Every structure is written in structure tokens, then in C-alpha cells.
Amino acid sequence: VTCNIKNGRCEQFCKNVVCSCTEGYRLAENQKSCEPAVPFPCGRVSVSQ
Amino acid sequence: VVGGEDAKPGQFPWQVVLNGKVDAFCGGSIVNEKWIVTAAHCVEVKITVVAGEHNIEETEHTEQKRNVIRIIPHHNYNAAINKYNHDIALLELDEPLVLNSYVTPICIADKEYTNIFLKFGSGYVSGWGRVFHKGASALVLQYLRVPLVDRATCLRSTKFTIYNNMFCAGFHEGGRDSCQGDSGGPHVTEVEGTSFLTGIISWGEECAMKGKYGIYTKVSRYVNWIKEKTKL
Numbered sequence: 001v002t003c004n005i006k007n008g009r010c011e012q013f014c015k016n017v018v019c020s021c022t023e024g025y026r027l028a029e030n031q032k033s034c035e036p037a038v039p040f041p042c043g044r045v046s047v048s049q
Numbered sequence: 050v051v052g053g054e055d056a057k058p059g060q061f062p063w064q065v066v067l068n069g070k071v072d073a074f075c076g077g078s079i080v081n082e083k084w085i086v087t088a089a090h091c092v093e094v095k096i097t098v099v100a101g102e103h104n105i106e107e108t109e110h111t112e113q114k115r116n117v118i119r120i121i122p123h124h125n126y127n128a129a130i131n132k133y134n135h136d137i138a139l140l141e142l143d144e145p146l147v148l149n150s151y152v153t154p155i156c157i158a159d160k161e162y163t164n165i166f167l168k169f170g171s172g173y174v175s176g177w178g179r180v181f182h183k184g185a186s187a188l189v190l191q192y193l194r195v196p197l198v199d200r201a202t203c204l205r206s207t208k209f210t211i212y213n214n215m216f217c218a219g220f221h222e223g224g225r226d227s228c229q230g231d232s233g234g235p236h237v238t239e240v241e242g243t244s245f246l247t248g249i250i251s252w253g254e255e256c257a258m259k260g261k262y263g264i265y266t267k268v269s270r271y272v273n274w275i276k277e278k279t280k281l
């Protein structure tokens with residue numbers, strides 16, 4: 001209901017709610033989560049650990 | 050990094066190492082295929098950057114070495130006044146890096162969210178710096194989770210001036226810390242499986258000494274400048 005409580009349930013960014021993601025990601029079907037929109041998005045480990 | 054662990058291949062794919070008069074003298078972070086962010090005191094001399102590095106003494110075929118064609122220290126950096134204040138610089142590479150599982154940028158949120166993520170209070174630092182106070186540098190990339198230290202505790206730890214856009218991180222009893230050679234490298238915060246750059250490894254006194262902490266530059270203070278100068 002508001003960004004000032006649990007970040008409006010947004011995985012990355014919230015705006016008074018409208019969730020958004022950093023470059024290389026798109027807002028998922030659930031309108032909260034962020035999913036890769038490019039082959040190698042920033043800040044993620046893709047080699048097996 | 051004193052008291053850290055060996056990073057696995059591709060665990061910190063945004064990490065780069067800088068080579069100059071001495072090899073592996075500072076670290077840096079990939080902003081995008083053409084730009085690295087580091088500390089200004091590191092590049093204050095011809096430099097080369099190596100991305101996709103894991104073990105500096107063994108060719109793993111994931112490395113990408115590039116010449117630096119432009120160095121942009123922040124306009125408020127002045128080493129003759131203070132070597133470690135406004136301590137951030139950008140390096141432009143001669144040819145773009147090829148993004149892959151070993152060479153991937155670090156995310157950078159806006160000013161507000163970079164400060165929110167720093168305030169989560171736990172970040173990861175990495176680099177090939179000294180593994181002991183006045184000791185040998187690492188061959189394999191090291192990493193360490195460091196807690197954020199409150200400003201009042203930070204100010205009491207040193208006689209030197211800690212400005213408001215610097216932060217302290219480390220442990221009350223020492224033993225684990227960043228060290229010389231890690232400078233310029235990243236301090237990142239994991240936000241639900243995506244890492245964001247929250248600090249630049251900057252300076253400190255005796256590495257891992259009880260009562261002393263590593264000092265870092267707040268990335269939130271420089272986000273507009275980083276995004277303006279590194280635009281592709």
C-alpha cells in the first residue's frame with residue numbers, strides 16, 4: 001500500500017505503489033519482482049557455485 | 050583482505066584489478082563494458098585493468114585485459130588537500146569488455162536507494178590486497194562480509210577526520226578487514242540476489258587491528274556523476 005512500509009513489497013525500487021527495477025531487469029508478471037531482461041544483467045552470479 | 054575467504058570463479062564478476070608501476074596495486078568495479086569505478090588515490094602513470102581475474106598467477110582463460118584511455122577523478126578530489134576525501138575516479142577502457150559469467154557489471158541504484166542499501170548494514174568487499182598487516186598480497190581473489198559501524202563508534206576509532214560521505218565497516222575485535230591493494234574495489238550489498246555498489250574501498254590505519262575500521266566512500270554521494278560520465 002505504501003513504499004514507507006516493506007518497500008511497497010517491491011523487490012528493488014518503489015514509487016508512490018509502482019514497482020521498478022534497475023537497468024537490465026524488467027518488472028515481473030506479479031508487478032513486484034524483478035527478472036533478467038538481458039543475457040548478463042548487473043550484479044548477478046551466473047557461474048555455478 | 051585480512052581474514053577473508055577465496056572467492057570461487059565468477060563469484061564477484063564485477064571485480065577488476067589494476068596494474069601500473071606494481072601489478073595488483075588497487076581494485077575497481079565494472080560500471081559497464083567501457084567504464085570502471087575506482088578510488089582517485091589509486092590513479093593520481095599508465096594503467097591496465099584485468100576483468101574476469103580469479104588467480105593472478107594462473108591463466109584461467111576468463112581474463113580480459115584493457116588499457117585505460119581516460120581517467121576522470123571526481124572534480125572535488127584534490128590530493129594536495131586530502132589524499133582520501135572525494136576519493137572516487139572513473140577509468141575508460143580502450144576497447145569494450147565482453148559481458149559474460151566472469152565479466153558482469155555491478156548494479157548502481159539512485160542516490161536514495163544506494164543509501165537505503167548501505168543502511169541494511171552488511172556488505173561484501175573483495176580484492177587481491179594484503180592478507181595480513183604489512184604482509185603478502187593475495188594470489189586468489191579474497192572476499193569478506195563486513196558489518197557497517199555506527200558513525201559515533203567510527204569517529205572515536207581514529208584521530209583522522211571521517212567525513213559524512215565516508216563510512217566505517219569491520220569488526221570490533223579486528224581480525225578481518227580490507228587492506229592496502231583492495232583500495233578502489235567494491236563494497237556491495239545483496240538485495241534479494243542482486244548486488245548493488247554501496248561503497249568504494251578507500252583507506253584505513255593498521256589492517257585488522259582491534260579498535261580500527263576500514264574507511265569507505267559512500268557511492269550514494271556520487272551516483273549522478275557516475276551515471277553522467279559513464280553513459281553509453
Ligand SMILES: Cc1ccc(-c2ncnc(Nc3ccc(C(=N)N)cc3Cl)c2O)cc1
Pocket residue numbers: 074075090091092093226227228229230231232233250251252253254255256257262263264
Ligand atoms: C597509488 C596508491 C597510493 C596509496 C595507496 C594506499 N596506501 C595505503 N593504504 C591504502 N589502503 C588501505 C589501508 C588500510 C586499510 C584498512 N585499515 N582497512 C584499507 C585500505 Cl584500502 C592505500 O590504498 C594505494 C595506492
